[PDB]
């Protein structure tokens, strides 16, 4: 049986504040700029539509040097940091971005038509953009976040997959890495392996995987380390209703309609797809720049940062403004020439993480050691190399950032005022 | 007229919230006669359909509508959870 950490984790009266200075990220909104011949990334892809997964490193409270150490017995017990307060500061002005594709697979406008559309020739793709669905979310836990998305499932050993055959789906659980993309209105799927077309969605998600937090799975998690607190806010509506060019993969059963004739003799593509639109963004609806007091967790792990680690996942599309900056090739002619100017796109993100940590102690009795050992043997081994080297996240080092004077920091003042004593 | 269910939102979600069936407005206060229980649901706030198309040929570097078979699929994900209270009836 699993038990609340409140059972075996003792709470001291010591609190420390820790915060990143001010994280900054600048890059191209849709794709990374690199040397054609090369593969080294010159400019990275930085979009408001990517997940930001911060791997927070905390100083080992056992190796740490406290002014007083009488508060615990280093022989019978050990120390762990407990996250009690978080403030995800965001810094750019609110605004909405926009993504498209020069060759988006969009046949005709099916929202309203005055006459039957012509006939699909070869490549009827259009240059089209859209404002993605709005999403604000924040996940906190001592284990990285887990997402779900639809990918291409493995086929059954029978009927040989005829070329062009529809690929099988499979919900795939994955680890959400820093830089991954969020569902933008086309659901959470792997567009690379499910769309040979390469033109069904805008460039920025076009050959990526849009993942959705698997909240269900994470909360079911027995120990609940992956996430002990979260805030989600997503909204979306249909801006336009389109058709997909291409060829019928699956025909419309004729028992569903009466054959036409002349123009209506041939059925138009009924492979409709809508254009998303996350409406207006607003201050009143902000999730960030507000402190989160992680006092009672719904999981058994009540904010204990086992391994002196801490994960903070964030997605904020309420500051997705992309800025176009163009340089002139010549500063002479007083006559505009498109060609005299090179147009570019850049997007900036501004973060500022702040935390309030509470020192905790664990008396290593038999039972406790058995439990903690079963739960995560590494805990004890590390007490008296990176297991997630495969994954990549925004590394954040706070080992030199802890301060006992909450007083001197904004999140600190807030915490004191909130907790009174 | 053509309908349109406007924007969908988290704040308006009905699910992923627990429902405590303590006082029923009917005479049957949540008794599951026959050890049966019916849970009817309708949720159009996750109706996203995803189009997936496979290429008939992986050669030509020139788009041809005829080279790709377009399809449509939709996925639904549920997870039902209940808390039951044992009851007795003196016959």
């Amino acid at each position: 049986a699993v038990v609340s950490t409140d059972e075996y984790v003792a709470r001291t009266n010591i609190y420390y504040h820790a915060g990143t200075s001010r994280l900054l990220a600048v890059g191209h909104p849709y794709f990374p700029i690199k040397k054609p011949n090369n593969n080294k990334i010159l400019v990275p892809k930085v979009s408001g539509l990517q997940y930001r997964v911060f791997r927070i490193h905390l100083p080992d409270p056992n190796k740490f040097g406290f002014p007083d150490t009488s508060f615990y017995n280093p022989d019978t017990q050990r120390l762990v940091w407990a996250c009690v307060g978080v403030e995800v500061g965001r810094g750019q002005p609110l605004g909405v971005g926009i993504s498209g594709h020069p060759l988006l697979n969009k046949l005709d406008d099916t929202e309203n038509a005055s006459a039957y559309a012509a006939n699909a020739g070869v490549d009827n793709r259009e240059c089209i953009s859209m404002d993605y669905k709005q999403t604000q979310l924040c996940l906190i836990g001592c284990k990285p976040p887990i997402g779900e998305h639809w990918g291409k499932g493995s086929p059954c050993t029978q009927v040989a997959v005829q070329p062009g055959d529809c690929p099988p789906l499979e919900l795939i659980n994955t680890v959400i890495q820093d830089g991954d993309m969020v569902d933008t209105g086309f659901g959470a799927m792997d567009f690379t392996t499910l769309q040979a077309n390469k033109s069904e969605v805008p460039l920025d998600i076009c050959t990526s995987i849009c993942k959705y937090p698997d909240y269900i799975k994470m909360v079911s998690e027995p120990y609940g380390d992956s996430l002990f607190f979260y805030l989600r806010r997503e909204q979306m509506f249909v801006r336009h209703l389109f058709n997909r060019a291409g060829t019928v993969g699956e025909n419309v059963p004729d028992d569903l309609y009466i054959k036409g004739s002349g123009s209506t003799a041939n059925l138009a593509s009924s492979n409709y797809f809508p254009t998303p639109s996350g409406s207006m963004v607003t201050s009143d609806a902000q999730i960030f720049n507000k402190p989160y007091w992680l006092q009672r967790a719904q999981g058994h792990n009540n904010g204990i940062c086992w391994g002196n680690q801490l994960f903070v996942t964030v997605v904020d599309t309420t500051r997705s403004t992309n800025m176009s900056l163009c340089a002139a090739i010549s500063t002479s002619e007083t006559t505009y020439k498109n060609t005299n100017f090179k147009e570019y796109l850049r997007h900036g993100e501004e973060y500022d993480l702040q935390f309030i940590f509470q020192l905790c102690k664990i008396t290593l009795t038999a039972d406790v050691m058995t439990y903690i050992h079963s739960m995560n043997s590494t805990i004890l081994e590390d007490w008296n190399e990176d297991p997630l080297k495969k994954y990549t996240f925004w590394e954040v080092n706070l080992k030199e950032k802890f301060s006992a004077d909450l007083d001197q920091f904004p999140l600190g003042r807030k915490f004191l005022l909130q907790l009174g004593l | 007229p053509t309908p349109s269910g406007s924007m969908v939102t988290s704040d308006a979600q009905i699910f992923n919230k627990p429902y405590w069936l303590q006082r029923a407005q009917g005479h049957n206060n949540g008794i599951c006669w026959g050890n049966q229980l019916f849970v009817t649901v309708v949720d159009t706030t996750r109706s996203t359909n995803m189009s997936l198309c496979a290429a008939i040929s992986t050669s030509e570097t020139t788009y041809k509508n005829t080279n790709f078979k377009e399809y449509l699929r939709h996925g639904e994900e549920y997870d039902l959870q209940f808390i039951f209270q044992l009851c007795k009836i003196t016959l």
Partner: antibody
Amino acid sequence: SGAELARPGASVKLSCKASGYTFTSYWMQWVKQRPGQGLEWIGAIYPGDGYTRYTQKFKGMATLTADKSSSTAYMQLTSLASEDSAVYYCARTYAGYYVGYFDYWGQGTTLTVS
Amino acid sequence: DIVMTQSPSSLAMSAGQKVTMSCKSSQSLFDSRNQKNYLAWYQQKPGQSPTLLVYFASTRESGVPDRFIGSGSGTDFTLTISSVQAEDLADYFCQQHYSTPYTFGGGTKLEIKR
């Protein structure tokens, strides 16, 4: 496929091998021409998805199928009678769900029922 | 079904004469969708398979001699050979490609006088 002699009451299956194009993208027609007579439409098949269309006259007489891996279309004629003795052609109408012209014809297969 | 009537059923002309053949449809072949008349003309020379001459009523297939002219619309179509040559000896057929079933006209047999 080559000329064929079958007896009344029997069945025959003739083939049409495609070449020179992405077979699975194009619809195939089958057409009947009796000795000294005109052309009659039998039916059409879309190898890519297996869809068939038949002239009411030939429903129950002709069965169309195709084999993607060999780019070959087949037509089976059952319950044969002397009325079925004729030259049979296979032909391509161009790619799509539209109703196009017949742009390529096979050399034809002569069926004698006797 | 849409019935197609070709006339005349046979025509004998000497080399250099203008040949006119008519084709009727029971229903209009004009699709307002792309404003085309879905009519094709085919040429079947002795011992050969039909060859496409004209489609969309008046569009000549590449490789077909320019003496072949298709025209007309709706229910009345014409295939003209401006100056008939000896090699034009053939049966000529019209076929609608407007909705199903596809039906063929009865054919015109063009013979050469000399």
